[PDB]
Amino acid sequence: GTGGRFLRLGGSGLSVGDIGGSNQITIPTNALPSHQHGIPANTHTHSVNDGGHG
Amino acid sequence: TIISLIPPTAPIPAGYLELLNSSQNVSRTTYSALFVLWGTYYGNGDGSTTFGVPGTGGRFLRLGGSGLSVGDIGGSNQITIPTNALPSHQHGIPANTHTHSVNDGGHG
């Protein structure tokens, strides 16, 4: 059955009638290109606790 | 060319040359019509007594046009996503907590 597939000559280790391939593709983890995210401007303070000192 | 679902056990049809993964070389005297129609367009073989016929290694069938000549080659099953093409995204930053030690010494 054709199965709505593409016509592929199979010289390299592919007998006649061989199937395979996939219309759905999944990006593997190692395929992700290198990229760098920017961290926005930040600002904070710390409250200070003290009962006193003699 | 013609296409066939012939299993490897079955014999090749008479008057037909089987294309393989690798480009082959065939005698010029025989397949005389094929040679005069092709010549050394897909290989020259020995250059005098043979000529080259193209090979199809795992390749897909694609029609001509768009400036592409017959018998051209190209493509790849392996793809690398260019760093330019990448879905725009932002990661969240996990909740954290830090304190700073105090350099107080002493005062009077």
Coordinates of N, CA, C and O in Angstrom, one line a residue:
Chain A
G1 N 0.8 -1.2 0.0 CA 0.0 0.0 0.0 C 0.9 1.2 0.0 O 1.9 1.3 0.7
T2 N 0.5 2.2 -0.8 CA 1.2 3.5 -0.9 C 1.3 4.2 0.4 O 2.3 4.7 0.9
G3 N 0.2 4.3 1.1 CA 0.1 4.9 2.4 C 0.4 6.4 2.3 O 0.7 7.0 3.4
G4 N 0.2 7.0 1.2 CA 0.4 8.5 1.0 C 1.9 8.9 1.3 O 2.1 9.9 2.0
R5 N 2.8 8.1 0.9 CA 4.2 8.3 1.2 C 4.9 8.9 0.0 O 4.4 9.1 -1.1
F6 N 6.2 9.2 0.2 CA 7.1 9.7 -0.8 C 7.8 8.6 -1.5 O 8.1 7.6 -1.0
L7 N 8.2 8.9 -2.8 CA 8.9 7.9 -3.6 C 10.4 8.0 -3.3 O 11.0 9.1 -3.6
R8 N 11.0 7.0 -2.8 CA 12.4 7.0 -2.4 C 13.1 5.8 -3.0 O 12.8 4.6 -2.7
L9 N 14.1 6.1 -3.9 CA 15.0 5.0 -4.3 C 15.9 4.5 -3.2 O 16.3 5.3 -2.3
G10 N 16.1 3.2 -3.1 CA 16.7 2.6 -1.9 C 18.0 1.9 -2.1 O 18.2 0.8 -1.6
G11 N 18.9 2.6 -2.9 CA 20.2 1.9 -3.2 C 21.0 1.6 -1.9 O 21.6 0.5 -1.8
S12 N 21.0 2.5 -1.0 CA 21.9 2.4 0.2 C 21.2 1.6 1.3 O 20.4 2.1 2.1
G13 N 21.4 0.2 1.3 CA 20.9 -0.6 2.3 C 19.4 -0.6 2.6 O 18.9 -0.5 3.7
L14 N 18.6 -0.5 1.5 CA 17.1 -0.4 1.6 C 16.5 -1.3 0.5 O 16.5 -1.0 -0.7
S15 N 15.9 -2.4 1.0 CA 15.3 -3.4 0.0 C 14.0 -2.7 -0.5 O 13.6 -1.6 -0.1
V16 N 13.4 -3.4 -1.5 CA 12.2 -2.8 -2.2 C 11.1 -3.0 -1.2 O 11.0 -3.9 -0.4
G17 N 10.1 -2.0 -1.3 CA 9.0 -2.0 -0.4 C 9.3 -1.6 1.0 O 8.4 -1.6 1.9
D18 N 10.5 -1.2 1.3 CA 10.8 -0.7 2.6 C 10.1 0.6 3.0 O 9.9 1.5 2.1
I19 N 9.7 0.8 4.2 CA 9.0 1.9 4.7 C 9.8 2.5 5.9 O 10.9 2.0 6.2
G20 N 9.3 3.6 6.4 CA 9.9 4.2 7.5 C 9.6 5.7 7.5 O 8.6 6.1 6.9
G21 N 10.5 6.5 8.0 CA 10.3 8.0 8.0 C 9.2 8.4 9.0 O 8.6 7.5 9.7
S22 N 9.0 9.7 9.0 CA 7.9 10.2 9.9 C 7.6 11.6 9.5 O 8.5 12.4 9.3
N23 N 6.3 11.9 9.4 CA 5.9 13.3 9.1 C 6.0 14.1 10.3 O 6.1 15.4 10.2
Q24 N 5.8 13.5 11.5 CA 6.0 14.3 12.8 C 7.4 14.2 13.2 O 8.0 13.1 13.2
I25 N 8.0 15.3 13.6 CA 9.4 15.4 13.9 C 9.5 16.0 15.3 O 8.8 16.9 15.7
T26 N 10.4 15.4 16.1 CA 10.6 15.8 17.5 C 12.1 16.3 17.7 O 13.0 15.5 17.4
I27 N 12.2 17.5 18.2 CA 13.6 18.1 18.4 C 14.2 17.4 19.5 O 13.7 17.4 20.7
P28 N 15.4 16.7 19.4 CA 16.1 16.1 20.5 C 16.8 17.2 21.3 O 17.0 18.3 20.9
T29 N 17.1 16.8 22.6 CA 17.7 17.7 23.5 C 19.1 18.3 23.0 O 19.3 19.5 23.0
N30 N 19.9 17.4 22.4 CA 21.2 17.8 21.9 C 21.1 18.6 20.6 O 22.1 19.2 20.2
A31 N 19.9 18.7 20.0 CA 19.8 19.5 18.8 C 19.6 21.0 19.1 O 19.7 21.8 18.1
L32 N 19.3 21.4 20.3 CA 19.0 22.8 20.7 C 20.2 23.6 20.4 O 21.3 23.4 21.0
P33 N 20.1 24.7 19.6 CA 21.3 25.6 19.4 C 21.6 26.3 20.7 O 20.8 26.6 21.5
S34 N 22.9 26.7 20.8 CA 23.4 27.4 21.9 C 22.8 28.8 21.9 O 22.7 29.5 20.9
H35 N 22.3 29.3 23.1 CA 21.7 30.6 23.2 C 21.9 31.1 24.6 O 22.1 30.3 25.5
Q36 N 21.8 32.4 24.8 CA 22.0 33.0 26.1 C 20.8 33.9 26.4 O 20.5 34.8 25.6
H37 N 20.2 33.7 27.6 CA 19.1 34.6 28.0 C 19.6 35.7 28.8 O 20.6 35.7 29.5
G38 N 18.9 36.9 28.7 CA 19.3 38.1 29.4 C 18.5 38.2 30.7 O 17.3 37.8 30.7
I39 N 19.2 38.5 31.7 CA 18.5 38.7 33.0 C 18.2 40.2 33.2 O 19.1 41.1 33.0
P40 N 17.0 40.6 33.5 CA 16.6 42.0 33.6 C 17.2 42.7 34.8 O 17.9 42.0 35.6
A41 N 17.0 44.0 34.9 CA 17.5 44.7 36.0 C 16.8 44.3 37.3 O 15.6 44.0 37.3
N42 N 17.6 44.2 38.4 CA 17.1 43.8 39.7 C 17.4 44.8 40.7 O 18.3 45.6 40.6
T43 N 16.7 44.7 41.8 CA 16.8 45.7 42.9 C 16.2 45.1 44.2 O 15.0 44.6 44.1
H44 N 16.9 45.1 45.3 CA 16.3 44.6 46.5 C 17.0 45.2 47.7 O 18.1 45.8 47.6
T45 N 16.3 45.2 48.9 CA 16.9 45.6 50.1 C 16.6 44.5 51.2 O 15.7 43.7 51.0
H46 N 17.5 44.5 52.2 CA 17.3 43.6 53.3 C 16.9 44.4 54.6 O 17.6 45.3 54.9
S47 N 15.8 44.0 55.2 CA 15.5 44.6 56.5 C 16.6 44.2 57.5 O 17.2 43.1 57.4
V48 N 16.8 45.0 58.5 CA 17.8 44.8 59.6 C 17.1 44.7 60.9 O 16.2 45.5 61.2
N49 N 17.4 43.7 61.7 CA 16.8 43.5 63.0 C 17.9 43.7 64.1 O 19.0 43.1 64.0
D50 N 17.5 44.4 65.1 CA 18.4 44.7 66.2 C 17.6 45.1 67.4 O 16.9 46.1 67.3
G51 N 17.9 44.5 68.6 CA 17.2 44.9 69.8 C 17.8 46.0 70.5 O 17.2 46.7 71.4
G52 N 19.1 46.2 70.2 CA 19.9 47.3 70.9 C 21.2 46.8 71.4 O 21.4 45.6 71.4
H53 N 22.0 47.7 71.8 CA 23.3 47.4 72.4 C 23.6 48.4 73.5 O 23.5 49.6 73.3
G54 N 24.0 47.9 74.7 CA 24.6 48.8 75.7 C 26.1 49.0 75.4 O 26.7 48.3 74.6
Chain B
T1 N 13.5 5.8 -17.8 CA 13.4 4.9 -16.7 C 12.0 4.5 -16.4 O 11.0 5.1 -16.7
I2 N 11.9 3.3 -15.8 CA 10.7 2.7 -15.3 C 10.9 2.3 -13.8 O 12.0 2.1 -13.4
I3 N 9.8 2.3 -13.1 CA 9.8 1.9 -11.6 C 9.2 0.6 -11.5 O 8.2 0.2 -12.2
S4 N 9.7 -0.2 -10.6 CA 9.2 -1.6 -10.4 C 9.3 -2.0 -8.9 O 10.3 -1.6 -8.2
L5 N 8.3 -2.7 -8.4 CA 8.4 -3.3 -7.1 C 8.9 -4.8 -7.2 O 8.3 -5.7 -6.7
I6 N 10.0 -5.0 -7.9 CA 10.6 -6.3 -8.1 C 11.4 -6.7 -6.9 O 12.4 -6.0 -6.5
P7 N 11.1 -7.8 -6.3 CA 11.9 -8.3 -5.2 C 13.3 -8.7 -5.7 O 13.4 -9.1 -6.9
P8 N 14.3 -8.7 -4.8 CA 15.6 -9.0 -5.3 C 15.7 -10.4 -5.9 O 16.6 -10.7 -6.7
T9 N 14.9 -11.3 -5.4 CA 14.8 -12.7 -6.0 C 14.4 -12.7 -7.5 O 15.0 -13.4 -8.3
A10 N 13.5 -11.9 -7.8 CA 12.9 -11.9 -9.2 C 14.0 -11.4 -10.2 O 14.8 -10.6 -9.8
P11 N 13.9 -11.9 -11.4 CA 14.9 -11.4 -12.4 C 14.6 -10.1 -13.0 O 13.5 -9.6 -13.0
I12 N 15.7 -9.4 -13.4 CA 15.6 -8.1 -14.1 C 14.8 -8.2 -15.4 O 15.1 -9.2 -16.1
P13 N 13.9 -7.3 -15.7 CA 13.3 -7.4 -17.0 C 14.3 -7.2 -18.2 O 15.3 -6.5 -18.0
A14 N 14.0 -7.9 -19.3 CA 15.0 -7.9 -20.4 C 15.0 -6.5 -21.0 O 14.0 -5.9 -21.1
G15 N 16.2 -6.1 -21.5 CA 16.3 -4.8 -22.1 C 16.4 -3.7 -21.1 O 16.2 -2.5 -21.5
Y16 N 16.6 -3.9 -19.8 CA 16.6 -2.9 -18.8 C 17.9 -3.0 -17.9 O 18.3 -4.1 -17.6
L17 N 18.5 -1.9 -17.6 CA 19.7 -1.8 -16.8 C 19.3 -1.3 -15.4 O 18.6 -0.3 -15.3
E18 N 19.7 -2.0 -14.4 CA 19.3 -1.8 -13.0 C 20.3 -0.7 -12.4 O 21.5 -0.9 -12.4
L19 N 19.7 0.4 -11.9 CA 20.5 1.4 -11.3 C 20.7 1.1 -9.8 O 19.8 0.5 -9.2
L20 N 21.8 1.4 -9.3 CA 22.2 1.0 -7.9 C 22.5 2.3 -7.1 O 22.3 3.4 -7.5
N21 N 22.9 2.0 -5.9 CA 23.3 3.1 -5.0 C 24.5 4.0 -5.5 O 24.5 5.2 -5.4
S22 N 25.4 3.3 -6.1 CA 26.6 3.9 -6.6 C 26.6 4.0 -8.1 O 26.0 3.1 -8.8
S23 N 27.1 5.1 -8.7 CA 27.2 5.3 -10.1 C 28.0 4.2 -10.7 O 29.1 3.8 -10.2
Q24 N 27.5 3.6 -11.8 CA 28.1 2.5 -12.4 C 28.8 2.9 -13.8 O 28.6 4.0 -14.2
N25 N 29.5 2.0 -14.3 CA 30.1 2.2 -15.7 C 29.8 1.0 -16.5 O 29.9 -0.2 -16.1
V26 N 29.4 1.3 -17.8 CA 28.9 0.2 -18.7 C 29.6 0.5 -20.1 O 29.9 1.6 -20.5
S27 N 29.7 -0.6 -20.8 CA 30.4 -0.6 -22.1 C 29.7 0.3 -23.1 O 28.5 0.3 -23.1
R28 N 30.5 1.0 -23.9 CA 29.9 1.9 -24.9 C 29.3 1.2 -26.1 O 28.3 1.6 -26.7
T29 N 29.9 0.1 -26.5 CA 29.4 -0.7 -27.6 C 28.0 -1.2 -27.4 O 27.1 -1.0 -28.2
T30 N 27.8 -1.9 -26.3 CA 26.5 -2.3 -25.9 C 25.8 -1.1 -25.3 O 26.4 -0.1 -24.9
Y31 N 24.5 -1.2 -25.2 CA 23.6 -0.1 -24.8 C 24.0 1.2 -25.7 O 24.1 2.3 -25.2
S32 N 24.1 0.9 -27.0 CA 24.5 2.0 -27.9 C 23.5 3.1 -27.9 O 23.9 4.3 -27.9
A33 N 22.2 2.8 -28.0 CA 21.2 3.8 -28.0 C 21.2 4.6 -26.7 O 21.1 5.8 -26.7
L34 N 21.4 3.9 -25.6 CA 21.4 4.6 -24.3 C 22.6 5.5 -24.2 O 22.6 6.6 -23.7
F35 N 23.8 5.1 -24.8 CA 25.0 5.9 -24.8 C 24.8 7.2 -25.7 O 25.0 8.3 -25.2
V36 N 24.3 7.0 -26.9 CA 24.1 8.1 -27.8 C 23.1 9.1 -27.2 O 23.1 10.3 -27.5
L37 N 22.1 8.6 -26.4 CA 21.2 9.5 -25.8 C 21.8 10.2 -24.6 O 21.4 11.3 -24.2
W38 N 22.7 9.5 -23.9 CA 23.4 10.1 -22.7 C 24.8 10.5 -23.0 O 25.1 11.7 -22.7
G39 N 25.6 9.7 -23.5 CA 27.1 10.0 -23.6 C 27.7 9.9 -22.3 O 27.4 9.1 -21.4
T40 N 28.7 10.8 -22.0 CA 29.3 11.0 -20.7 C 28.6 12.1 -19.9 O 29.2 13.0 -19.3
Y41 N 27.3 12.0 -19.8 CA 26.5 13.0 -19.0 C 26.4 12.6 -17.5 O 26.2 13.5 -16.7
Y42 N 26.6 11.3 -17.2 CA 26.6 10.9 -15.8 C 27.8 10.1 -15.5 O 27.8 9.1 -14.7
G43 N 28.9 10.4 -16.1 CA 30.2 9.7 -15.9 C 30.8 9.3 -17.2 O 30.1 9.1 -18.2
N44 N 32.1 9.1 -17.2 CA 32.8 8.7 -18.5 C 33.4 7.4 -18.4 O 34.0 6.9 -19.5
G45 N 33.4 6.7 -17.3 CA 34.0 5.3 -17.2 C 35.4 5.4 -17.5 O 36.2 6.2 -17.0
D46 N 35.9 4.5 -18.4 CA 37.3 4.5 -18.8 C 37.6 5.6 -19.8 O 38.8 5.9 -20.0
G47 N 36.6 6.3 -20.3 CA 36.7 7.4 -21.3 C 36.7 7.0 -22.7 O 36.5 7.8 -23.6
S48 N 37.0 5.7 -23.0 CA 37.0 5.2 -24.4 C 35.9 4.1 -24.6 O 35.1 4.2 -25.5
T49 N 35.9 3.1 -23.8 CA 35.1 1.9 -24.0 C 33.9 1.8 -23.1 O 33.0 1.0 -23.3
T50 N 33.8 2.7 -22.1 CA 32.7 2.7 -21.1 C 32.2 4.1 -21.0 O 32.7 5.1 -21.5
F51 N 31.1 4.2 -20.2 CA 30.5 5.5 -19.8 C 29.7 5.3 -18.6 O 29.4 4.1 -18.2
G52 N 29.5 6.4 -17.8 CA 28.9 6.3 -16.5 C 27.4 6.5 -16.5 O 26.9 7.4 -17.2
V53 N 26.8 5.7 -15.7 CA 25.3 5.8 -15.4 C 25.2 6.2 -13.9 O 25.9 5.7 -13.1
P54 N 24.2 7.1 -13.6 CA 24.1 7.7 -12.3 C 23.7 6.6 -11.3 O 22.9 5.7 -11.6
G55 N 24.1 6.8 -10.0 CA 23.6 6.0 -8.9 C 22.6 6.7 -8.0 O 22.6 7.9 -7.9
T56 N 21.8 5.9 -7.4 CA 20.7 6.4 -6.5 C 20.9 5.8 -5.1 O 20.4 4.7 -4.8
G57 N 21.7 6.5 -4.3 CA 21.9 6.0 -2.9 C 20.9 6.5 -1.9 O 21.1 7.6 -1.4
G58 N 19.9 5.7 -1.6 CA 18.9 6.1 -0.6 C 18.2 7.4 -0.9 O 17.5 8.0 0.0
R59 N 18.2 7.9 -2.1 CA 17.7 9.2 -2.5 C 16.2 9.2 -2.8 O 15.7 8.1 -3.1
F60 N 15.6 10.3 -2.7 CA 14.2 10.5 -2.9 C 13.9 10.9 -4.4 O 14.8 11.4 -5.1
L61 N 12.7 10.6 -4.8 CA 12.3 10.9 -6.2 C 11.8 12.4 -6.2 O 10.9 12.7 -5.4
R62 N 12.4 13.2 -7.0 CA 11.9 14.6 -7.1 C 11.9 15.1 -8.5 O 12.8 14.8 -9.3
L63 N 10.8 15.7 -8.9 CA 10.6 16.2 -10.2 C 11.5 17.4 -10.5 O 12.1 18.0 -9.6
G64 N 11.6 17.7 -11.8 CA 12.5 18.8 -12.2 C 11.8 20.2 -12.1 O 10.7 20.3 -11.6
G65 N 12.5 21.2 -12.6 CA 12.0 22.5 -12.6 C 12.7 23.4 -11.5 O 13.6 22.9 -10.8
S66 N 12.3 24.6 -11.4 CA 12.8 25.6 -10.5 C 14.3 25.8 -10.7 O 15.1 25.9 -9.8
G67 N 14.8 25.8 -12.0 CA 16.2 25.9 -12.3 C 17.0 24.7 -12.1 O 18.2 24.8 -12.3
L68 N 16.4 23.6 -11.7 CA 17.2 22.4 -11.4 C 17.3 21.5 -12.6 O 16.2 21.1 -13.2
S69 N 18.5 21.2 -13.1 CA 18.7 20.4 -14.2 C 18.4 18.9 -13.8 O 18.3 18.5 -12.7
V70 N 18.2 18.1 -14.9 CA 18.0 16.7 -14.7 C 19.3 16.1 -14.1 O 20.4 16.5 -14.4
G71 N 19.1 15.0 -13.3 CA 20.3 14.3 -12.8 C 21.1 15.1 -11.7 O 22.2 14.8 -11.5
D72 N 20.4 16.1 -11.1 CA 21.1 16.8 -10.1 C 21.1 16.1 -8.7 O 20.4 15.0 -8.6
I73 N 21.8 16.6 -7.8 CA 21.9 15.9 -6.5 C 21.9 16.9 -5.4 O 22.0 18.1 -5.6
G74 N 21.6 16.5 -4.1 CA 21.7 17.4 -3.0 C 20.8 16.8 -1.9 O 20.2 15.8 -2.0
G75 N 20.6 17.7 -0.9 CA 19.8 17.3 0.3 C 20.6 16.6 1.4 O 21.7 16.2 1.2
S76 N 19.9 16.4 2.5 CA 20.5 15.7 3.6 C 19.4 15.3 4.6 O 18.5 16.1 4.9
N77 N 19.5 14.1 5.1 CA 18.5 13.7 6.2 C 18.9 14.3 7.5 O 18.0 14.4 8.4
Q78 N 20.1 14.7 7.7 CA 20.6 15.3 9.0 C 20.4 16.8 9.0 O 20.8 17.5 8.0
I79 N 19.7 17.4 10.0 CA 19.4 18.8 10.0 C 20.0 19.4 11.3 O 19.8 18.8 12.4
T80 N 20.6 20.5 11.2 CA 21.1 21.3 12.4 C 20.3 22.6 12.4 O 20.3 23.4 11.4
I81 N 19.6 22.8 13.5 CA 18.8 24.1 13.6 C 19.8 25.2 13.7 O 20.6 25.3 14.7
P82 N 19.7 26.2 12.8 CA 20.6 27.4 13.0 C 20.3 28.1 14.2 O 19.1 28.2 14.6
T83 N 21.3 28.7 14.8 CA 21.1 29.5 16.1 C 20.2 30.7 15.8 O 19.5 31.2 16.7
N84 N 20.2 31.2 14.6 CA 19.3 32.3 14.2 C 17.8 31.9 14.4 O 17.0 32.7 14.8
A85 N 17.5 30.7 13.9 CA 16.1 30.2 14.0 C 15.9 29.4 15.3 O 16.5 28.3 15.4
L86 N 15.2 29.9 16.2 CA 15.0 29.3 17.5 C 13.7 30.0 18.2 O 13.7 31.2 18.2
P87 N 12.8 29.2 18.7 CA 11.6 29.9 19.2 C 12.0 30.8 20.4 O 12.7 30.4 21.3
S88 N 11.4 32.0 20.3 CA 11.7 33.0 21.4 C 11.0 32.6 22.6 O 9.8 32.3 22.7
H89 N 11.8 32.6 23.7 CA 11.3 32.1 25.0 C 12.1 32.7 26.1 O 13.1 33.3 26.0
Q90 N 11.5 32.6 27.3 CA 12.1 33.1 28.6 C 11.9 32.0 29.7 O 10.8 31.5 29.8
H91 N 13.0 31.7 30.4 CA 12.9 30.8 31.5 C 12.5 31.5 32.8 O 12.8 32.7 33.0
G92 N 11.8 30.9 33.6 CA 11.5 31.4 35.0 C 12.8 31.2 35.8 O 13.6 30.4 35.6
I93 N 12.8 32.0 36.9 CA 14.0 32.0 37.8 C 13.4 31.5 39.1 O 12.5 32.1 39.7
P94 N 14.0 30.4 39.7 CA 13.4 29.8 40.9 C 13.5 30.8 42.1 O 14.4 31.6 42.2
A95 N 12.5 30.7 43.0 CA 12.6 31.5 44.2 C 13.8 31.2 45.0 O 14.2 30.1 45.2
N96 N 14.5 32.3 45.5 CA 15.7 32.1 46.3 C 15.7 33.1 47.5 O 14.7 33.8 47.7
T97 N 16.7 33.0 48.2 CA 16.9 33.8 49.5 C 18.3 33.9 49.8 O 19.0 32.8 49.9
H98 N 18.8 35.1 50.1 CA 20.2 35.3 50.5 C 20.3 36.3 51.6 O 19.4 37.2 51.7
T99 N 21.3 36.2 52.4 CA 21.7 37.2 53.4 C 23.1 37.6 53.3 O 23.9 36.9 52.7
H100 N 23.4 38.8 53.8 CA 24.7 39.3 53.8 C 25.3 39.4 55.2 O 24.6 39.9 56.1
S101 N 26.5 38.9 55.4 CA 27.1 39.1 56.7 C 27.5 40.5 56.9 O 27.7 41.3 56.0
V102 N 27.6 40.9 58.2 CA 27.9 42.3 58.6 C 29.3 42.4 59.0 O 29.9 41.6 59.8
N103 N 30.0 43.5 58.5 CA 31.3 43.9 58.9 C 31.2 45.0 59.9 O 31.3 46.2 59.5
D104 N 31.0 44.7 61.2 CA 30.7 45.8 62.2 C 31.9 46.3 62.9 O 32.0 47.5 63.1
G105 N 32.8 45.4 63.4 CA 33.8 45.9 64.2 C 33.3 46.4 65.6 O 32.5 45.6 66.2
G106 N 33.6 47.6 65.9 CA 33.0 48.2 67.1 C 33.2 49.7 67.1 O 34.0 50.2 66.4
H107 N 32.2 50.3 67.8 CA 32.2 51.8 67.9 C 32.1 52.3 69.3 O 31.6 51.5 70.2
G108 N 32.5 53.5 69.5 CA 32.4 54.1 70.8 C 31.6 55.4 70.7 O 31.1 55.8 69.7

